[PDB]
Design a protein around this ligand. Structure first.
Ligand code: 3Z1
Length: 257
C-alpha cells in the first residue's frame, strides 16, 4: 500500500492533537515548504463524518488574510480511514501563549491590543459575511503567521468564552461569536499574573462585573465590551459595527507594519 502522506512529505514533529485529529509539521519534498497537516481519523458516526466532509469543502472555498491558508485535503485507507488537511504553518506560540508571555500592562499597549483585536474581528466579519460562524472562538484558536499576521481557525491543539445560549444548549446565531469577541478584547487589554486570577476575573466579566481600573483606563473599550457581552444576542453589535468603531481608526505603535 502506497501512502500519499509518507510518499510526498518528510515529517518534522508532532504539533499536537485534539478531538478526532493529530497535527504534524511536515515538509513537502517537491515544493520544499513546511506545512501543518491534520490527520483526522474518520469517526464511526455517519453524521459526524457528514460534518467533517462538509467542513473541509467549506474551508476550501475561503480566502481571507485572517483565515489560515488552505492547501490540500485527501483520504487514505491503510490495510482505519484518515482525512488529511494541509494548511499554512503558523508560529507555535498562539494568542493564549502570547498573552501568557506579556503579564504587565506595559506589555499590553492599547494600540497593539486593538490592532490584534481588529484582525480577529475582521476575520469574524468575513466568516459571517459568508454565512459561516466560528462557534468556538478563543485565544487557543487564534495563531500568528511567521510575519505576525493573526490567523483565526479551528486548530484542535488541546468553557469561559462561549455564549450563555451555547452553554444552556439552546439554538443560536452568528451572534455567539460576538460574545467571544467581547471576552477576548477585555483579555487582550487586561494582563493576568496567575491562572486563578484569570478565571475569577473573566467569570466576573462574563457577568458584566469589571475591574474598576479597566473601566477608568479604557472607557471606550469598556462600553464596547459591555455591548458584545449582552445576555440577549440581538442586543450584541454586528462584526461590521465593531470594526467601524472610531477606536480602530489610525492605529500605530513603534515597530508596526
Ligand atoms: C503550531 N503551528 C500550526 N500552524 C498551523 C496549524 C493549522 C491547523 C489547522 C489544520 C491542520 C487544519 C484545519 C485548520 C482549520 O482552521 N480548519 C477549519 C475548518 C473549517 C472552518 O470553517 C469552514 C475553519 C474556519 F476558520 F473557516 F472557521 C477552519 C487548522 N487551523 C492546525 C494546527 C496548526 N498549527
Amino acid at each position: 500500500y502506497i501512502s500519499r502522506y509518507l510518499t510526498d512529505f518528510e515529517p518534522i514533529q508532532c504539533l499536537g492533537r485534539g478531538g478526532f485529529g493529530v497535527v504534524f509539521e511536515a515538509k513537502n519534498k517537491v515544493d520544499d515548504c513546511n506545512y501543518a497537516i491534520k490527520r483526522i481519523r474518520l469517526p464511526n458516526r455517519e453524521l459526524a463524518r457528514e460534518k467533517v466532509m462538509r467542513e473541509v469543502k467549506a474551508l476550501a472555498k475561503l480566502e481571507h488574510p485572517g483565515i489560515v491558508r488552505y492547501f490540500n485535503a485527501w483520504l487514505e485507507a491503510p490495510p482505519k480511514v484518515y482525512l488529511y488537511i494541509q494548511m499554512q504553518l503558523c508560529r507555535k506560540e498562539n494568542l493564549k501563549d502570547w498573552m501568557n508571555g506579556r503579564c504587565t500592562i506595559e506589555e499590553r499597549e492599547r494600540s497593539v491590543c486593538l490592532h490584534i483585536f481588529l484582525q480577529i474581528a475582521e476575520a469574524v466579519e468575513f466568516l459571517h459575511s459568508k454565512g459561516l460562524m466560528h462557534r468556538n472562538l478563543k485565544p487557543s484558536n487564534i495563531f500568528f503567521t511567521m510575519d505576525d499576521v493573526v490567523k483565526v481557525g479551528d486548530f484542535g491543539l488541546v468553557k469561559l468564552y462561549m455564549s450563555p445560549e451555547q452553554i444552556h444548549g439552546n439554538s443560536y446565531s452568528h451572534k455567539v461569536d460576538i460574545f467571544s469577541l467581547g471576552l477576548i478584547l477585555f483579555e487582550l487589554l487586561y494582563p493576568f499574573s496567575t491562572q486563578m486570577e484569570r478565571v475569577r476575573t473573566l467569570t466576573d466579566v462574563r457577568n458584566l462585573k469589571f475591574p474598576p481600573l479597566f473601566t477608568q483606563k479604557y472607557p471606550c473599550e469598556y462600553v464596547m465590551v459591555q455591548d458584545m457581552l449582552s445576555p440577549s444576542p440581538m442586543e450584541r453589535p454586528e462584526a461590521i459595527n465593531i470594526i467601524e468603531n472610531a477606536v480602530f481608526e489610525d492605529l500605530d505603535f513603534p515597530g508596526k507594519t
